[PDB]
Design a protein around this ligand. Structure first.
Ligand code: SHH
Ligand code: SHH
Ligand code: K
Ligand code: K
Ligand code: K
Ligand code: K
Ligand code: ZN
Ligand code: ZN
Lengths: 371, 364
């Protein structure tokens, strides 16, 4: 079918106001439009999440606080720190609207998958995977990934969450840590001192969800080839062991070379092969954005990935558009890896893969109501 | 005889409004106050920099552009992007006031050194070393470090600028890249892709300023002892060859273990050891802050350093105060290094030191 593209001019404008990534939404969309990729997609206007929809994960008390702060702006409300607001997650005007819009956008995309409208639905402004039920975290206030998965859960019994952001998707993993309906897989930088500090290979979920959480700790400097070897290896084992019926894929672009966080050393081509491998499963796939703080590079990456979804090859020259001047000095779509070492010892990587393969041996495929 | 401490309730309050580091000024000050360190210091209220004083480095067109944005906002002004305003340096109300306040505080501190008022003057909310003469850069809109050096030049023949921030102090180095009367030494993370991307060991300044710029490219995971070995080794040769008459020291705390940038693996003790070595010279020293994005750790670091300057030993236990709850889970002054590898191979490090020693044979 034709992939669904969650978009409206109001939605993009709303997302443009996110304090940590100002104007990133417009840069991403305008580049995608400049390559005319929206013409080959089914543009679907996002619905704003209702209170009840957001409440599927978040507590009423926290949501009401976000609502209060959203009006009164950045006063120093006595309870804001308790709800994770502050440095990482600024308590400014309109944050409840931003939450409701992004959350609802991911829910809308999920509903498109359910209603069989498409096999792939895209919400590049989604993918905020840190927020807890009662606490903002990691640059955002709501966990739209969880809300998307919870929506898909209405129809799908086995859901695979794949998180390729530079950071560990702790919020999503924690949300489903005790259940086996949702398997979380996160490839991320894992290093003492690095946010959020969780997600070692030994972290496998708890209770009845034990072994239904997969973590792949990776060090600085990893490039396309080695990343894909790890990803395909893990994903092949996961697919075989878990047999998912629907996929939610987070594609945070803070792994891409040039990102100020300067950790991984990836290009969108590498992420693209991971995406390709997931696509050929031909399952309902919910595509999400996430981190990405080299704004022009993030637009580069997600535009390319959009092209991969459409099975189209894009021209190297960045076409003229609103933000053309931000693509200097070369004004091309390709991204060149930085000249720095890959700190990943192959035998450590292999040991990690071995642990994971062993963990997945414990994974069964049971139907609703088993035994 | 007693160190000058640049402070006023209004100054700290204004610095709290900096977008990239909210509340950090109050956290630093309240912890210093909680240790009663301000009682052993001479509290000097900072004066606001005038357009003339800021003009000693920054162009009038840029300065007037800041004031326009500061009195209005980001009305998508077409020239803002050219003046460095944007992602790193947001164009909001009050940015001119912020710049004038911090610049004027570094100038006030420098003026204290001149008036024989002290041998150490401190401006923790200063140390913003990236901004160009006509362009905002690196989380701030003004180069207060440069403005401080220029003020000291009204008295001292030779100024040594030591930059121990995680990032290359490119704004300062570039401002004095052609001159021999100001020498810049910067220890920083140097790795392709890491801001600002400059400051290799081969970069030594230009023209008459050749060899009067020192850069020490360091990799991730460096801890206290190795760092001080490098810093002492460099500053030993520098002091012996350049013979400074005044020192401007930038102590950005983004090198400290626990910083979200997660690059270096330092504790305030290692930095303090570098600071003691500089204070040993007994020259007029201008203390500056800078980076530091683990806000509690930054307060921890600069409170400790304030104690080093006063020659005092602080209690291990964080005393109760306004931000006490932010000091968990251990509530202690000391910071523990992260269990990360040091990526600095000793051969490359020693080769860098030789290269620097070689360059320092031309300075006389
Ligand atoms: O994309 C992300 C990043 C959100 C978490 C941010 C971690 C905290 C951090 O990096 N803070 C920081 C970095 C640089 C300067 C100041 C603060 N997660 O998926
Ligand atoms: O401390 C400083 C300021 C450094 C400014 C670094 C700008 C690049 C950067 O780190 N950007 C960034 C990081 C995380 C999230 C968003 C942007 N200088 O010494
Ligand atoms: K991840
Ligand atoms: K699970
Ligand atoms: K430095
Ligand atoms: K110089
Ligand atoms: Zn991330
Ligand atoms: Zn810095």
């Amino acid at each position: 079918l034709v992939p669904v593209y969650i978009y409206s001019p109001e939605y993009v404008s709303m997302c443009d106001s996110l304090a940590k990534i100002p104007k990133r939404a417009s840069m991403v969309h305008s580049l995608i439009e400049a390559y005319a990729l929206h013409k080959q997609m089914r543009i679907v206007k996002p619905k704003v999440a209702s209170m009840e929809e957001m409440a599927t994960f978040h507590t009423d008390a926290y949501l009401q606080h976000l609502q209060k702060v959203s009006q009164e702006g950045d006063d120093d409300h006595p309870d804001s720190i308790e709800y994770g607001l502050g440095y990482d997650c600024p308590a400014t005007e309109g944050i409840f609207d931003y939450a409701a819009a992004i959350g609802g956008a991911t829910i809308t995309a999920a509903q498109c998958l359910i209603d069989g409208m498409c096999k792939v639905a895209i919400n590049w402004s989604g993918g905020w995977h840190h927020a807890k039920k009662d606490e903002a975290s990691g640059f955002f206030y709501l966990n739209d990934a969880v809300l998307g998965i919870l929506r898909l859960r209405r129809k799908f019994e086995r859901i695979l969450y794949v998180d390729l952001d530079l950071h560990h998707g702790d919020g999503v993993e924690d949300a489903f840590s005790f259940t086996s309906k949702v398997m979380t897989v996160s490839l991320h930088k894992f290093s003492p001192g690095f946010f959020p500090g969780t997600g070692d290979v030994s972290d496998v979920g708890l209770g009845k969800g034990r072994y239904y959480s997969v973590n792949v700790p990776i060090q600085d400097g990893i490039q396309d080839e080695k990343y894909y070897q790890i990803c395909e290896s893990v994903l092949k084992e996961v697919y075989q062991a878990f047999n998912p019926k629907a996929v939610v894929l987070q594609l945070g672009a803070d792994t891409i070379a040039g990102d100020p966080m300067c950790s991984f050393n990836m290009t969108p081509v590498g992420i693209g092969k991971c995406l390709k491998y997931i696509l050929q499963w031909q399952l309902a796939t919910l595509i999400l954005g996430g981190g990405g703080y080299n704004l022009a590079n993030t637009a580069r990456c997600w535009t390319y990935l959009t092209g991969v979804i459409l099975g189209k090859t894009l021209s190297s020259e960045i076409p003229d558009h609103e933000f053309f001047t931000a693509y200097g000095p070369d004004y091309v779509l390709e991204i060149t890896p930085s000249c720095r070492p890959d700190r990943n010892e192959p035998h450590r990587i292999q040991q990690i893969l071995n642990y994971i393969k062993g963990n997945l041996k414990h994974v069964v495929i049971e139907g609703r109501g088993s035994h």
